[PDB]
């Protein structure tokens, strides 16, 4: 599913993420925007051989099983492919570990370049919350 901004945010919101460990919903929207461009199903091959997945662009590195990432975690005791789904809660429910791990957001590597710092507000302007 391809979410629209304000569509996502709603979402997002309901799932607990606005101000989740002090990030602002227009945070997460904005990630979200950058990694998958509001697509559920998108996928994408990192250069050590695992996988990101969803909306988040989940990595099986560490947070999902794929059987195809030798060596990896499954922290979020999921199937990658749950984060595909047209529901966003596997993906926020596992986002919600990972931005809990040490480093907030910088998990989120186009988050750090293309979110931090901005004017993050904007992505969530206009919308009904
Ligand atoms: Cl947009
Ligand atoms: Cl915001
Ligand atoms: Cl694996
Ligand atoms: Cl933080
Ligand atoms: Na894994
Ligand atoms: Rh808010
Ligand atoms: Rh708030
Ligand atoms: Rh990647
Ligand atoms: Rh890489
Ligand atoms: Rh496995
Ligand atoms: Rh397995
Ligand atoms: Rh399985
Ligand atoms: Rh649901
Ligand atoms: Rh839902
Ligand atoms: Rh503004």
Request: charged share 20%.
């Amino acid at each position: 599913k391809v979410f629209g901004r304000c569509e996502l945010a709603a979402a997002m919101k309901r799932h607990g993420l606005d101000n989740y460990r002090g990030y602002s919903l227009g945070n997460w929207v904005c990630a979200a925007k950058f990694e998958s461009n509001f697509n559920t199903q998108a996928t994408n091959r990192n250069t050590d051989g695992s996988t990101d997945y969803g909306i988040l662009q989940i990595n099986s590195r560490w947070w999902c099983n794929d059987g195809r990432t030798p060596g990896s975690r499954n922290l979020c005791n999921i199937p990658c492919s749950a984060l595909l789904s047209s529901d966003i809660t596997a993906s926020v429910n596992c986002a919600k570990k990972i931005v809990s791990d040490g480093n907030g957001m910088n998990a989120w590597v186009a988050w750090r370049n293309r979110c931090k710092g901005t004017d993050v507000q904007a992505w969530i302007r206009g919308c009904r919350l």
